[PDB]
Design a binder for these strands. Structure first.
Ligand SMILES: NC(=[NH2+])NCCC[C@H](N)C(=O)O
Ligand SMILES: [Mg+2]
Ligand SMILES: [Mg+2]
Ligand SMILES: [Mg+2]
Ligand SMILES: [Mg+2]
Ligand SMILES: [Mg+2]
Ligand SMILES: [Mg+2]
Ligand SMILES: [Mg+2]
Ligand SMILES: [Mg+2]
Ligand SMILES: [Mg+2]
Ligand SMILES: [Mg+2]
Ligand SMILES: [Mg+2]
Ligand SMILES: [Mg+2]
Ligand SMILES: [Mg+2]
Ligand SMILES: [Mg+2]
Ligand SMILES: [Mg+2]
Ligand SMILES: [Mg+2]
Ligand SMILES: [Mg+2]
Ligand SMILES: [Mg+2]
Ligand SMILES: [Mg+2]
Ligand SMILES: [Mg+2]
Ligand SMILES: [Mg+2]
Ligand SMILES: [Mg+2]
Ligand SMILES: [Mg+2]
Ligand SMILES: [Mg+2]
Ligand SMILES: [Mg+2]
Ligand SMILES: [Mg+2]
Ligand SMILES: [Mg+2]
Ligand SMILES: [Mg+2]
Ligand SMILES: [Mg+2]
Ligand SMILES: [Mg+2]
Ligand SMILES: [Mg+2]
Ligand SMILES: [Mg+2]
Ligand SMILES: [Mg+2]
Ligand SMILES: [Mg+2]
Ligand SMILES: [Mg+2]
Ligand SMILES: [Mg+2]
Ligand SMILES: [Mg+2]
Ligand SMILES: [Mg+2]
Ligand SMILES: [Mg+2]
Ligand SMILES: [Mg+2]
Ligand SMILES: [Mg+2]
Ligand SMILES: [Mg+2]
Ligand SMILES: [Mg+2]
Ligand SMILES: [Mg+2]
Ligand SMILES: [Mg+2]
Ligand SMILES: [Mg+2]
Ligand SMILES: [Mg+2]
Ligand SMILES: [Mg+2]
Ligand SMILES: [Mg+2]
Ligand SMILES: [Mg+2]
Ligand SMILES: [Mg+2]
Ligand SMILES: [Mg+2]
Ligand SMILES: [Mg+2]
Ligand SMILES: [Mg+2]
Ligand SMILES: [Mg+2]
Ligand SMILES: [Mg+2]
Ligand SMILES: [Mg+2]
Ligand SMILES: [Mg+2]
Ligand SMILES: [Mg+2]
Ligand SMILES: [Mg+2]
Ligand SMILES: [Mg+2]
Ligand SMILES: [Mg+2]
Ligand SMILES: [Mg+2]
Ligand SMILES: [Mg+2]
Ligand SMILES: [Mg+2]
Ligand SMILES: [Mg+2]
Ligand SMILES: [Mg+2]
Ligand SMILES: [Mg+2]
Ligand SMILES: [Mg+2]
Ligand SMILES: [Mg+2]
Ligand SMILES: [Mg+2]
Ligand SMILES: [Mg+2]
Ligand SMILES: [Mg+2]
Ligand SMILES: [Mg+2]
Ligand SMILES: [Mg+2]
Ligand SMILES: [Mg+2]
Ligand SMILES: [Mg+2]
Ligand SMILES: [Mg+2]
Ligand SMILES: [Mg+2]
Ligand SMILES: [Mg+2]
Ligand SMILES: [Mg+2]
Ligand SMILES: [Mg+2]
Ligand SMILES: [Mg+2]
Ligand SMILES: [Mg+2]
Ligand SMILES: [Mg+2]
Ligand SMILES: [Mg+2]
Ligand SMILES: [Mg+2]
Ligand SMILES: [Mg+2]
Ligand SMILES: [Mg+2]
Ligand SMILES: [Mg+2]
Ligand SMILES: [Mg+2]
Ligand SMILES: [Mg+2]
Ligand SMILES: [Mg+2]
Ligand SMILES: [Mg+2]
Ligand SMILES: [Mg+2]
Ligand SMILES: [Mg+2]
Ligand SMILES: [Mg+2]
Ligand SMILES: [Mg+2]
Ligand SMILES: [Mg+2]
Ligand SMILES: [Mg+2]
Ligand SMILES: [Mg+2]
Ligand SMILES: [Mg+2]
Ligand SMILES: [Mg+2]
Ligand SMILES: [Mg+2]
Ligand SMILES: [Mg+2]
Ligand SMILES: [Mg+2]
Ligand SMILES: [Mg+2]
Ligand SMILES: [Mg+2]
Ligand SMILES: [Mg+2]
Ligand SMILES: [Mg+2]
Ligand SMILES: [Mg+2]
Ligand SMILES: [Mg+2]
Ligand SMILES: [Mg+2]
Ligand SMILES: [Mg+2]
Ligand SMILES: [Mg+2]
Ligand SMILES: [Mg+2]
Ligand SMILES: [Mg+2]
Ligand SMILES: [Mg+2]
Ligand SMILES: [Mg+2]
Ligand SMILES: [Mg+2]
Ligand SMILES: [Mg+2]
Ligand SMILES: [Mg+2]
Ligand SMILES: [Mg+2]
Ligand SMILES: [Mg+2]
Ligand SMILES: [Mg+2]
Ligand SMILES: [Mg+2]
Ligand SMILES: [Mg+2]
Ligand SMILES: [Mg+2]
Ligand SMILES: [Mg+2]
Ligand SMILES: [Mg+2]
Ligand SMILES: [Mg+2]
Ligand SMILES: [Mg+2]
Ligand SMILES: [Mg+2]
Ligand SMILES: [Mg+2]
Ligand SMILES: [Mg+2]
Ligand SMILES: [Mg+2]
Ligand SMILES: [Mg+2]
Ligand SMILES: [Mg+2]
Ligand SMILES: [Mg+2]
Ligand SMILES: [Mg+2]
Ligand SMILES: [Mg+2]
Ligand SMILES: [Mg+2]
Ligand SMILES: [Mg+2]
Ligand SMILES: [Mg+2]
Ligand SMILES: [Mg+2]
Ligand SMILES: [Mg+2]
Ligand SMILES: [Mg+2]
Ligand SMILES: [Mg+2]
Ligand SMILES: [Mg+2]
Ligand SMILES: [Mg+2]
Ligand SMILES: [Mg+2]
Ligand SMILES: [Mg+2]
Ligand SMILES: [Mg+2]
Ligand SMILES: [Mg+2]
Ligand SMILES: [Mg+2]
Ligand SMILES: [Mg+2]
Ligand SMILES: [Mg+2]
Ligand SMILES: [Mg+2]
Ligand SMILES: [Mg+2]
Ligand SMILES: [Mg+2]
Ligand SMILES: [Mg+2]
Ligand SMILES: [Mg+2]
Ligand SMILES: [Mg+2]
Ligand SMILES: [Mg+2]
Ligand SMILES: [Mg+2]
Ligand SMILES: [Mg+2]
Ligand SMILES: [Mg+2]
Ligand SMILES: [Mg+2]
Ligand SMILES: [Mg+2]
Ligand SMILES: [Mg+2]
Ligand SMILES: [Mg+2]
Ligand SMILES: [Mg+2]
Ligand SMILES: [Mg+2]
Ligand SMILES: [Mg+2]
Ligand SMILES: [Mg+2]
Ligand SMILES: [Mg+2]
Ligand SMILES: [Mg+2]
Ligand SMILES: [Mg+2]
Ligand SMILES: [Mg+2]
Ligand SMILES: [Mg+2]
Ligand SMILES: [Mg+2]
Ligand SMILES: [Mg+2]
Ligand SMILES: [Mg+2]
Ligand SMILES: [Mg+2]
Ligand SMILES: [Mg+2]
Ligand SMILES: [Mg+2]
Ligand SMILES: [Mg+2]
Ligand SMILES: [Mg+2]
Ligand SMILES: [Mg+2]
Ligand SMILES: [Mg+2]
Ligand SMILES: [Mg+2]
Ligand SMILES: [Mg+2]
Ligand SMILES: [Mg+2]
Ligand SMILES: [Mg+2]
Ligand SMILES: [Mg+2]
Ligand SMILES: [Mg+2]
Ligand SMILES: [Mg+2]
Ligand SMILES: [Mg+2]
Ligand SMILES: [Mg+2]
Ligand SMILES: [Mg+2]
Ligand SMILES: [Mg+2]
Ligand SMILES: [Mg+2]
Ligand SMILES: [Mg+2]
Ligand SMILES: [Mg+2]
Ligand SMILES: [Mg+2]
Ligand SMILES: [Mg+2]
Ligand SMILES: [Mg+2]
Ligand SMILES: [Mg+2]
Ligand SMILES: [Mg+2]
Ligand SMILES: [Mg+2]
Ligand SMILES: [Mg+2]
Ligand SMILES: [Mg+2]
Ligand SMILES: [Mg+2]
Ligand SMILES: [Mg+2]
Ligand SMILES: [Mg+2]
Ligand SMILES: [Mg+2]
Ligand SMILES: [Mg+2]
Ligand SMILES: [Mg+2]
Ligand SMILES: [Mg+2]
Ligand SMILES: [Mg+2]
Ligand SMILES: [Mg+2]
Ligand SMILES: [Mg+2]
Ligand SMILES: [Mg+2]
Ligand SMILES: [Mg+2]
Ligand SMILES: [Mg+2]
Ligand SMILES: [Mg+2]
Ligand SMILES: [Mg+2]
Ligand SMILES: [Mg+2]
Ligand SMILES: [Mg+2]
Ligand SMILES: [Mg+2]
Ligand SMILES: [Mg+2]
Ligand SMILES: [Mg+2]
Ligand SMILES: [Mg+2]
Ligand SMILES: [Mg+2]
Ligand SMILES: [Mg+2]
Ligand SMILES: [Mg+2]
Ligand SMILES: [Mg+2]
Ligand SMILES: [Mg+2]
Ligand SMILES: [Mg+2]
Ligand SMILES: [Mg+2]
Ligand SMILES: [Mg+2]
Ligand SMILES: [Mg+2]
Ligand SMILES: [Mg+2]
Ligand SMILES: [Mg+2]
Ligand SMILES: [Mg+2]
Ligand SMILES: [Mg+2]
Ligand SMILES: [Mg+2]
Ligand SMILES: [Mg+2]
Ligand SMILES: [Mg+2]
Ligand SMILES: [Mg+2]
Ligand SMILES: [Mg+2]
Ligand SMILES: [Mg+2]
Ligand SMILES: [Mg+2]
Ligand SMILES: [Mg+2]
Ligand SMILES: [Mg+2]
Ligand SMILES: [Mg+2]
Ligand SMILES: [Mg+2]
Ligand SMILES: [Mg+2]
Ligand SMILES: [Mg+2]
Ligand SMILES: [Mg+2]
Ligand SMILES: [Mg+2]
Ligand SMILES: [Mg+2]
Ligand SMILES: [Mg+2]
Ligand SMILES: [Mg+2]
Ligand SMILES: [Mg+2]
Ligand SMILES: [Mg+2]
Ligand SMILES: [Mg+2]
Ligand SMILES: [Mg+2]
Ligand SMILES: [Mg+2]
Ligand SMILES: [Mg+2]
Ligand SMILES: [Mg+2]
Ligand SMILES: [Mg+2]
Ligand SMILES: [Mg+2]
Ligand SMILES: [Mg+2]
Ligand SMILES: [Mg+2]
Ligand SMILES: [Mg+2]
Ligand SMILES: [Mg+2]
Ligand SMILES: [Mg+2]
Ligand SMILES: [Mg+2]
Ligand SMILES: [Mg+2]
Ligand SMILES: [Mg+2]
Ligand SMILES: [Mg+2]
Ligand SMILES: [Mg+2]
Ligand SMILES: [Mg+2]
Ligand SMILES: [Mg+2]
Ligand SMILES: [Mg+2]
Ligand SMILES: [Mg+2]
Ligand SMILES: [Mg+2]
Ligand SMILES: [Mg+2]
Ligand SMILES: [Mg+2]
Ligand SMILES: [Mg+2]
Ligand SMILES: [Mg+2]
Ligand SMILES: [Mg+2]
Ligand SMILES: [Mg+2]
Ligand SMILES: [Mg+2]
Ligand SMILES: [Mg+2]
Lengths: 116, 202, 149, 64
RNA sequence: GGGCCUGACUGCGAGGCCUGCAAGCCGAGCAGGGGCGAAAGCCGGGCCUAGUGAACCGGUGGUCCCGUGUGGAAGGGCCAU
RNA sequence: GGAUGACCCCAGGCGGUAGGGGAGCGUUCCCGAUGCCGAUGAAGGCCGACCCGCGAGGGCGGCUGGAGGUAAGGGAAGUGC
RNA sequence: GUGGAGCCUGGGAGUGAGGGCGCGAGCGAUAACGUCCGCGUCCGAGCGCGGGAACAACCGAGACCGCCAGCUAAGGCCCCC
RNA sequence: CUGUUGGGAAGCAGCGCCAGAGAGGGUGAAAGCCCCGUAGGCGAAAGGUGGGGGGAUAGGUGAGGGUACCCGAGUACCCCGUGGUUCGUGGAGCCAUGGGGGAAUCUGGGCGGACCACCGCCUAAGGCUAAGUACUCCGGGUGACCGAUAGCGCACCAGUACCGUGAGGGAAAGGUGAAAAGAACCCCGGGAGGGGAGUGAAAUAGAGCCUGAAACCGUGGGCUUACAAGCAGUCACGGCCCCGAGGGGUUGUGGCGUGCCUAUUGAAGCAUGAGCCGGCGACUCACGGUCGUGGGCGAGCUUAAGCCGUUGAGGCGGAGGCGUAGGGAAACCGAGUCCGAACAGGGCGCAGCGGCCGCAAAGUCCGCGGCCGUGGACCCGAAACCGGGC
RNA sequence: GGGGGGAACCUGGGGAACUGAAACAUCUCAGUACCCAGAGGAGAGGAAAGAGAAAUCGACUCCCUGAGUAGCGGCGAGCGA
């Protein structure tokens, strides 16, 4: 018996073109350019999932640094002090305290100054 | 080994049969594959790039046209050209070993015997060729058409009367075959067919 | 047992290897042929059993030996097939060429020669020849060697 | 169609009971005046072909 | 340097070196019949590593294995070159 | 572990071209099928932010369409761009 | 020394254009992103990740998946960062 | 047959009936019983056939003994040159014959692979001869055959249109609906086209007609954009719009970021290929081999062509094949054998698990799978070579 | 009585090359493709101046097998009773 293409390729192409919705020009209209764009997009998302963890740690550290310098020490002294005081609140929560609970963050600065 | 109900004007007697104890499903599958393959027509066919109607002329020069190079238009790259590795007329039959067929036959009957779905009969009372007659005989025989039946008898008149029934498959004893046995929920043979069956599996 | 229960045993019907059907299969593109060269081509190599890339082949450098024959061919002569005493153990009474041919021991068109592997039986054994030891063993066992011509 | 026996092999080689391939040693067809008795004598024996070459030759003899 | 000599053996060959193959290389020991030596022993060419060429086809000497109905023969095989 | 992939627990491996092996998805056709799904709407088309699946895919829902389609389990290939 | 170790038999391959770097030589001119070998390495196939401004093979390190958690490597900590 | 939903019943429901017929195709949808059929039967005045039956006719028919008349001529035969055969000059016979020479009539002649002898086989140089075999323009039956880029080149007015001086080359192009009920009439328009009306179950089924994807073009709407550096995405946050601790759309800013494929030591590469979309497009099949694997049987395993049956039924058939012994160039011997003087040494060979019973196995058969040989053998592509024509 | 036609099949008279031999000439492809003459529903062949070892068989044709055997072969590729 013969098995022609039939419906199979159109359905395969429509799955790809649906994923490429929103892309520019033929990148969302042509099956070939959509798939090439999707190849890059998939690698980017994987790479940026990793990169997002670093991006947010940088931001925390910058905010933590500025809150520290209002109390007369720098970030790197503040982190060492927390290490010697045994405090393990992470940078996501330290940065939130720096903005939302300045009293609590100040007492943390106190503990860090005292630990050295 | 097996106790087989017989249907008689003198009541449901019992006959003993030396049917195999072990039903081997893979082997039964091998017989059916053979039965279904050897009946194939093998008439699918296509045309090669040599058998298609076009000329062997090179459609345009090798070089300097700006097109891809080509020879004749029967090449399978062309719409309307030959088929690459299409079906050709083919013989699907093969010689399954005789002992596998014979032993397959016995296992298919033995499987029906072990379910209680095998029934032997001495005669078919008033079955003289008419469907309504075989129906009346079947009713008393316990064959109400709720189960498909493979009817194996040499009585030509009995086969003619039963054969139009959607739930009956009819065979002469020399035609007993495992595909037809396994196709049907019940097995009914007269004592004569039961005997040519025994001669075959011996 | 019905048709929807008929199944081959595991491994009785394996799927084929389909090449040139896509990256995920592991056999896409070059279709397990590697890259270029004569072997990748449709039509492929010269017979690997013989050809050696142009050098004189392993086989052709070895010497011929023996009678190869001449036209008009094989000289017709009587041929013998050995049958051991052990193979005769199944028989009783009188074993002969025609009988051993039936049981699948002797091949048609061959004269019978009894050889001496195994134990002789008290049998009348008709044959075209006997090894020295087959004679010894058959006499000593009470059997009777009858020698045809 | 059915394979053809290679007759160059059939004239040079034999398959033994266990499937080894045995051939006559090379090198004493001629130029023998200055070869020692040891060379002539040992070149008159059969030898067992190395496994890779023996497998190829056996494929050439499908009906032995 | 001299004496006697032909082992510059025949039939084999445990075991190895080398090595893709095919080749190449070393070889104790047993038998036959020898050489030299009182003997122990040595001798299967040459202090050693180059001095060489697989097959196919054909010549020659031997062998007396095959011999196309049979006996021969033709022509082959085998051993040596 | 329990007893034979029932599932759980602990540990370890899991970059990859040529290439070797394994397990699956889907397409056409046959048995299953004188069956079963179907005008209270087949196939195909167009949607979906929902469900299942690692994935290839499979469901389900709405719209279109207007007459076909075809299960568990197996079989065969003009089988996936 | 229990390792995606080793050995045996067999089925299937692909490869037989390498390249950079370190070290050891030859060739070259104590030239070449030169060339030809040896030992090793990486790229090839890790054009995946951090550093080196950018950059296959230099330094760091062998990416199963997820996390808006933590510790480090080379390299960094005036601003871009 | 009735009811019922429906444009329509064959669907569903009630109650029946036929069947040597429940193959299949129609009918407004899905029908054994409405139609065409199917099973089972029946049928030729005329022409054709008639291999079967019957009848003619042609033709066919003894034994000794003697006689030695006849028994296929430029033939046999030999030589030369070639062909045929498995035979390529080979030890080269046989069969055929272009050249030369050239018989005999059975006590004649040819053959059994040079030749000779022996022993046999056959009767050359005249002719005919059914059947079993091949093929498929034609008709029919049937498909794990195609379904409009497929299947014949052609489903259709095709060997046409068109191309070529000619030989020759050689397309595309199927589908309204159940029924034409194929849209009277009015309105804008020169017409085309449309808007109403009307038909229809349906009219984006309206003839440029089933379904009606994609590229491509346009109208409307949401978000967004004129200080901005870009393989066009991705991660984050915010704004707006939409659907109702959530999600979809959009993208302002910030971070990161060198297309795909091919070929390469190495490509984003300024190296190859691709305008975009849709459809067609490349590892197969037969036979043999080798190994693996699922079964059958096991010192055995297995049939081939056929024959009989069946009409999607299987069986019969042992001729033959592989295996059961090897070694040797062979004669030959044989669990051995070959080299050899060897009784030497060496090469190549030789030897199940349980309690008579299971089980397992040599081997072999069939299925499946990898790979090999033979074929075009994964697909496309030369320049060329040859034949017959134009 | 002939003439001319007929898809394929058949017989006879002539008869390539690419290709294969990983070059090529013998060899192969192949007495194939093709040209020509003729036959007919078939055609050819056919009633032993046979076979070839069986003290044997008994026209011819065709299928299976014998058998990729016997042999043939730049004893190569291959060919093949
Ligand atoms: N006795 C029988 N074979 N019955 C078979 C039923 C019908 C079958 N199709 C035939 O043609 O006969
Ligand atoms: Mg396709
Ligand atoms: Mg299609
Ligand atoms: Mg498609
Ligand atoms: Mg696709
Ligand atoms: Mg679709
Ligand atoms: Mg799809
Ligand atoms: Mg967008
Ligand atoms: Mg665009
Ligand atoms: Mg645009
Ligand atoms: Mg578009
Ligand atoms: Mg993706
Ligand atoms: Mg990630
Ligand atoms: Mg990353
Ligand atoms: Mg990290
Ligand atoms: Mg400070
Ligand atoms: Mg720290
Ligand atoms: Mg910490
Ligand atoms: Mg078929
Ligand atoms: Mg075709
Ligand atoms: Mg065809
Ligand atoms: Mg063609
Ligand atoms: Mg052609
Ligand atoms: Mg053609
Ligand atoms: Mg034509
Ligand atoms: Mg043509
Ligand atoms: Mg042509
Ligand atoms: Mg041409
Ligand atoms: Mg042409
Ligand atoms: Mg060009
Ligand atoms: Mg141009
Ligand atoms: Mg162009
Ligand atoms: Mg082109
Ligand atoms: Mg072009
Ligand atoms: Mg061209
Ligand atoms: Mg072409
Ligand atoms: Mg062509
Ligand atoms: Mg063509
Ligand atoms: Mg075309
Ligand atoms: Mg076609
Ligand atoms: Mg066409
Ligand atoms: Mg066509
Ligand atoms: Mg094709
Ligand atoms: Mg092809
Ligand atoms: Mg082709
Ligand atoms: Mg056929
Ligand atoms: Mg097959
Ligand atoms: Mg067959
Ligand atoms: Mg049998
Ligand atoms: Mg029936
Ligand atoms: Mg039926
Ligand atoms: Mg039934
Ligand atoms: Mg039936
Ligand atoms: Mg398969
Ligand atoms: Mg296959
Ligand atoms: Mg697989
Ligand atoms: Mg597949
Ligand atoms: Mg794939
Ligand atoms: Mg694989
Ligand atoms: Mg791979
Ligand atoms: Mg590719
Ligand atoms: Mg491979
Ligand atoms: Mg492969
Ligand atoms: Mg390969
Ligand atoms: Mg390459
Ligand atoms: Mg390569
Ligand atoms: Mg390539
Ligand atoms: Mg290469
Ligand atoms: Mg190449
Ligand atoms: Mg290669
Ligand atoms: Mg090709
Ligand atoms: Mg080639
Ligand atoms: Mg050379
Ligand atoms: Mg021979
Ligand atoms: Mg002959
Ligand atoms: Mg006795
Ligand atoms: Mg040879
Ligand atoms: Mg030699
Ligand atoms: Mg010699
Ligand atoms: Mg010689
Ligand atoms: Mg010397
Ligand atoms: Mg010597
Ligand atoms: Mg010498
Ligand atoms: Mg010697
Ligand atoms: Mg054989
Ligand atoms: Mg001296
Ligand atoms: Mg001296
Ligand atoms: Mg002396
Ligand atoms: Mg040794
Ligand atoms: Mg060696
Ligand atoms: Mg040397
Ligand atoms: Mg001595
Ligand atoms: Mg001595
Ligand atoms: Mg001595
Ligand atoms: Mg002395
Ligand atoms: Mg001495
Ligand atoms: Mg010595
Ligand atoms: Mg010297
Ligand atoms: Mg000296
Ligand atoms: Mg020297
Ligand atoms: Mg030498
Ligand atoms: Mg030589
Ligand atoms: Mg040669
Ligand atoms: Mg010779
Ligand atoms: Mg001689
Ligand atoms: Mg003799
Ligand atoms: Mg003779
Ligand atoms: Mg004599
Ligand atoms: Mg003699
Ligand atoms: Mg003489
Ligand atoms: Mg002689
Ligand atoms: Mg010699
Ligand atoms: Mg775990
Ligand atoms: Mg991996
Ligand atoms: Mg695996
Ligand atoms: Mg599947
Ligand atoms: Mg599935
Ligand atoms: Mg698919
Ligand atoms: Mg079909
Ligand atoms: Mg059906
Ligand atoms: Mg159906
Ligand atoms: Mg229903
Ligand atoms: Mg309706
Ligand atoms: Mg609807
Ligand atoms: Mg479907
Ligand atoms: Mg379909
Ligand atoms: Mg879906
Ligand atoms: Mg739908
Ligand atoms: Mg509708
Ligand atoms: Mg229908
Ligand atoms: Mg189905
Ligand atoms: Mg299924
Ligand atoms: Mg089945
Ligand atoms: Mg098929
Ligand atoms: Mg295809
Ligand atoms: Mg490993
Ligand atoms: Mg490894
Ligand atoms: Mg493989
Ligand atoms: Mg290779
Ligand atoms: Mg290579
Ligand atoms: Mg090379
Ligand atoms: Mg190289
Ligand atoms: Mg290179
Ligand atoms: Mg190198
Ligand atoms: Mg390397
Ligand atoms: Mg570089
Ligand atoms: Mg270096
Ligand atoms: Mg240094
Ligand atoms: Mg250096
Ligand atoms: Mg050096
Ligand atoms: Mg300088
Ligand atoms: Mg370099
Ligand atoms: Mg340098
Ligand atoms: Mg240098
Ligand atoms: Mg290196
Ligand atoms: Mg590479
Ligand atoms: Mg690296
Ligand atoms: Mg690596
Ligand atoms: Mg890469
Ligand atoms: Mg990067
Ligand atoms: Mg880097
Ligand atoms: Mg960097
Ligand atoms: Mg940087
Ligand atoms: Mg890197
Ligand atoms: Mg890893
Ligand atoms: Mg830290
Ligand atoms: Mg550091
Ligand atoms: Mg810096
Ligand atoms: Mg900073
Ligand atoms: Mg109504
Ligand atoms: Mg009604
Ligand atoms: Mg009803
Ligand atoms: Mg019927
Ligand atoms: Mg119907
Ligand atoms: Mg029907
Ligand atoms: Mg129905
Ligand atoms: Mg239906
Ligand atoms: Mg109907
Ligand atoms: Mg009828
Ligand atoms: Mg009728
Ligand atoms: Mg007379
Ligand atoms: Mg008389
Ligand atoms: Mg006379
Ligand atoms: Mg005469
Ligand atoms: Mg005359
Ligand atoms: Mg002549
Ligand atoms: Mg000739
Ligand atoms: Mg001749
Ligand atoms: Mg010769
Ligand atoms: Mg001759
Ligand atoms: Mg006479
Ligand atoms: Mg005479
Ligand atoms: Mg004659
Ligand atoms: Mg003569
Ligand atoms: Mg003669
Ligand atoms: Mg004769
Ligand atoms: Mg003779
Ligand atoms: Mg005579
Ligand atoms: Mg004769
Ligand atoms: Mg007749
Ligand atoms: Mg005739
Ligand atoms: Mg005839
Ligand atoms: Mg016919
Ligand atoms: Mg027809
Ligand atoms: Mg179809
Ligand atoms: Mg159809
Ligand atoms: Mg069309
Ligand atoms: Mg067409
Ligand atoms: Mg269509
Ligand atoms: Mg037609
Ligand atoms: Mg037309
Ligand atoms: Mg012109
Ligand atoms: Mg014209
Ligand atoms: Mg033309
Ligand atoms: Mg057309
Ligand atoms: Mg119409
Ligand atoms: Mg219509
Ligand atoms: Mg109007
Ligand atoms: Mg008007
Ligand atoms: Mg007007
Ligand atoms: Mg007007
Ligand atoms: Mg109008
Ligand atoms: Mg209007
Ligand atoms: Mg209306
Ligand atoms: Mg309606
Ligand atoms: Mg519509
Ligand atoms: Mg419509
Ligand atoms: Mg329709
Ligand atoms: Mg439409
Ligand atoms: Mg439209
Ligand atoms: Mg717009
Ligand atoms: Mg500015
Ligand atoms: Mg602005
Ligand atoms: Mg961005
Ligand atoms: Mg952020
Ligand atoms: Mg939102
Ligand atoms: Mg957003
Ligand atoms: Mg870029
Ligand atoms: Mg780059
Ligand atoms: Mg791609
Ligand atoms: Mg490319
Ligand atoms: Mg390139
Ligand atoms: Mg290049
Ligand atoms: Mg380059
Ligand atoms: Mg670029
Ligand atoms: Mg560019
Ligand atoms: Mg360029
Ligand atoms: Mg480019
Ligand atoms: Mg290029
Ligand atoms: Mg273009
Ligand atoms: Mg486009
Ligand atoms: Mg496409
Ligand atoms: Mg394959
Ligand atoms: Mg094929
Ligand atoms: Mg095949
Ligand atoms: Mg196989
Ligand atoms: Mg097998
Ligand atoms: Mg069996
Ligand atoms: Mg067994
Ligand atoms: Mg055979
Ligand atoms: Mg055997
Ligand atoms: Mg032998
Ligand atoms: Mg001797
Ligand atoms: Mg021995
Ligand atoms: Mg031994
Ligand atoms: Mg077995
Ligand atoms: Mg292989
Ligand atoms: Mg071919
Ligand atoms: Mg092919
Ligand atoms: Mg192939
Ligand atoms: Mg030209
Ligand atoms: Mg030429
Ligand atoms: Mg030429
Ligand atoms: Mg011409
Ligand atoms: Mg004429
Ligand atoms: Mg004429
Ligand atoms: Mg005529
Ligand atoms: Mg001829
Ligand atoms: Mg010519
Ligand atoms: Mg030629
Ligand atoms: Mg050819
Ligand atoms: Mg060819
Ligand atoms: Mg070849
Ligand atoms: Mg050639
Ligand atoms: Mg070549
Ligand atoms: Mg050439
Ligand atoms: Mg020829
Ligand atoms: Mg001819
Ligand atoms: Mg032809
Ligand atoms: Mg003529
Ligand atoms: Mg004519
Ligand atoms: Mg006829
Ligand atoms: Mg005739
Ligand atoms: Mg005649
Ligand atoms: Mg006569
Ligand atoms: Mg045989
Ligand atoms: Mg020939």
């Amino acid at each position: 018996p013969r098995a022609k293409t039939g419906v199979v390729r159109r359905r395969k192409h429509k799955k790809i073109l649906k994923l490429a919705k929103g892309y520019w020009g033929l990148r969302s209209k042509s099956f070939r350019k959509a798939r090439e764009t999707l190849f890059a997009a998939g690698n980017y998302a994987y790479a940026h999932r990793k990169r997002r963890k670093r991006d947010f740690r940088r931001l925390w550290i910058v905010r933590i640094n500025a809150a520290c310098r209002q109390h007369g020490l720098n970030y790197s002294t503040f982190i060492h002090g927390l290490k010697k005081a045994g405090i393990e609140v992470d940078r996501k929560n330290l940065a939130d305290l720096a903005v939302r609970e300045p009293q609590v963050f100040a007492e943390l600065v106190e503990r860090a100054k005292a630990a050295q | 080994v097996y106790q087989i109900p017989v249907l008689s004007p003198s009541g449901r007697r019992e006959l003993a049969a030396d049917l195999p104890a072990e039903i081997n499903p893979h082997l039964l599958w091998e017989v059916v594959r053979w039965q279904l393959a050897k009946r194939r027509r093998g008439t699918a066919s296509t045309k090669t790039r040599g058998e298609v109607a076009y000329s062997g002329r090179k459609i345009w020069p090798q070089k300097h046209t700006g097109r891809a190079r080509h020879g004749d238009i029967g090449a399978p790259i062309f719409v309307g050209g030959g088929v690459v590795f299409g079906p050709k007329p083919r013989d699907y039959s093969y010689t399954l070993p005789k002992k596998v067929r014979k032993k397959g036959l016995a296992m298919a009957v033995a499987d029906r015997a072990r379910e209680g779905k095998l029934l032997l009969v001495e005669a078919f009372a008033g079955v003289n060729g008419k469907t309504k007659e075989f129906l009346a005989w079947a009713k008393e025989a316990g064959l109400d058409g709720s189960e498909s039946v493979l009817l194996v008898t040499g009585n030509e008149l009995v086969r003619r009367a039963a054969r139009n029934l959607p739930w009956v498959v009819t065979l002469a004893p020399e035609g007993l075959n495992v595909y037809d046995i396994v196709r049907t929920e019940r097995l009914v043979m007269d004592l004569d067919a039961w005997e040519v069956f025994q001669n075959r599996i011996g | 047992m019905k048709l929807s229960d008929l199944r081959p045993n595991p491994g009785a019907n394996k799927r084929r290897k389909r090449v040139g059907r896509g990256p995920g299969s592991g056999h896409g593109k070059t279709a397990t042929r590697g890259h270029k060269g004569q072997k990748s081509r449709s039509g492929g190599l010269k017979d690997p059993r013989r050809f050696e890339g142009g050098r004189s082949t392993t086989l052709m450098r070895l010497p011929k030996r023996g009678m190869q024959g001449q036209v008009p061919g094989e000289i017709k002569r009587p041929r013998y097939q050995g049958v051991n005493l052990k193979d005769l153990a199944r028989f009783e009474g009188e074993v002969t060429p025609e009988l051993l041919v039936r049981a699948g021991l002797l091949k048609k068109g061959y004269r019978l020669k009894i050889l001496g592997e195994g134990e002789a039986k008290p049998l009348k054994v008709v044959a075209h020849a006997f090894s020295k030891s087959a004679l010894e063993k058959l006499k000593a066992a009470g059997g009777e060697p009858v020698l045809l011509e | 169609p059915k394979m053809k026996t290679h007759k160059g092999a059939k004239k040079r080689v034999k398959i033994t009971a266990s499937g080894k391939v045995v051939a006559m040693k090379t090198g004493k067809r001629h130029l023998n005046w200055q070869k020692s008795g040891k060379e002539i004598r040992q070149k008159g024996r059969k030898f067992v072909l190395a496994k890779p070459e023996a497998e190829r030759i056996k494929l050439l003899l499908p009906y032995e």
